[PDB]
């Protein structure tokens, strides 16, 4: 599974599942595609990311609802904790699946900056989702794994991509969220978001109209966060 399906048919079905908003199916088609062992193209990396972002986003939203209910019950039976744990375990499982694809063998075959930064950012992201539900000292090690992946991605991005590149911008955005929401470092988050915004603003002149729209969509998220954080 999905070992008998052609790679091209798995990519085609992931695009159909995305159109149908069937993200669990999309993720499983893309996991099958990765497991064929060939590197992924830019569009395929994006399908992989879209699929798992939507799966884990649903799980995160549900976990938050349940955690809030559980925290209120702690101002009456094991059910709320049991069910929050069930959703939590499922969420951890999807993060471990993603991290497993990256480790076997997406990151090690990724030589170009665009692919390597994309995957190292993904690694940061899924350890960050693990961290959101972790308690410890599991929690410290998972936070460190996120920070280390983001930091390697950031170092390559700053050497190899222009400050407007949407992947570099989305990496910096997610690392700033890691700092504010996970690492209890709101000043580092704000500094990162401001420096990344300003260096992209300075480079917009180099862009075509379409590239400018791509870059400014992510810059607007940095600005929204800075408005929330200050």
């Amino acid at each position: 599974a999905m070992g008998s399906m052609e790679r091209a048919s798995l990519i085609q079905k992931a695009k159909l599942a995305e159109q149908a908003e069937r993200y669990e199916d999309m993720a499983a088609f893309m996991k099958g595609a990765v497991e064929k062992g060939e590197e992924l193209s830019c569009e395929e990396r994006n399908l992989l990311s879209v699929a798992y972002k939507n799966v884990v986003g649903g799980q995160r939203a549900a976990w938050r609802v349940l955690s809030s209910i559980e925290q209120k019950s702690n101002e009456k039976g094991p059910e709320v904790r049991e069910y929050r744990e069930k959703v939590e375990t499922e969420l951890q499982g999807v993060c471990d699946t993603v991290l497993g694809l990256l480790d076997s063998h997406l990151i090690k075959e990724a030589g170009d900056a665009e692919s390597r930064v994309f995957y190292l950012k993904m690694k940061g992201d899924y350890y960050r989702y693990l961290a959101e539900v972790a308690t410890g000292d599991d929690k410290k090690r998972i936070i460190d794994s996120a920070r280390s992946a983001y930091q390697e991605a950031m170092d390559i991005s700053k050497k190899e991509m222009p400050p407007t590149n949407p992947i570099r911008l989305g990496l910096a955005l997610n690392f700033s969220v890691f700092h504010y929401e996970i690492a209890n470092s709101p000043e580092e988050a704000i500094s990162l978001a401001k420096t990344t915004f300003d260096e992209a603003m300075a480079d917009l002149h180099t862009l075509s109209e379409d590239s400018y729209k791509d870059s400014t969509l992510i810059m607007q998220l940095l600005r929204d966060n800075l408005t929330l954080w200050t």
């Binding site: 955005l173 997610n174 988050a189 966060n225 954080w229």
Partner: peptide, 8 residues
């Protein structure tokens, strides 16, 4: 909650 990179 802060906004992170969207699904695009």
């Amino acid at each position: 909650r802060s906004a992170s990179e969207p699904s695009l």
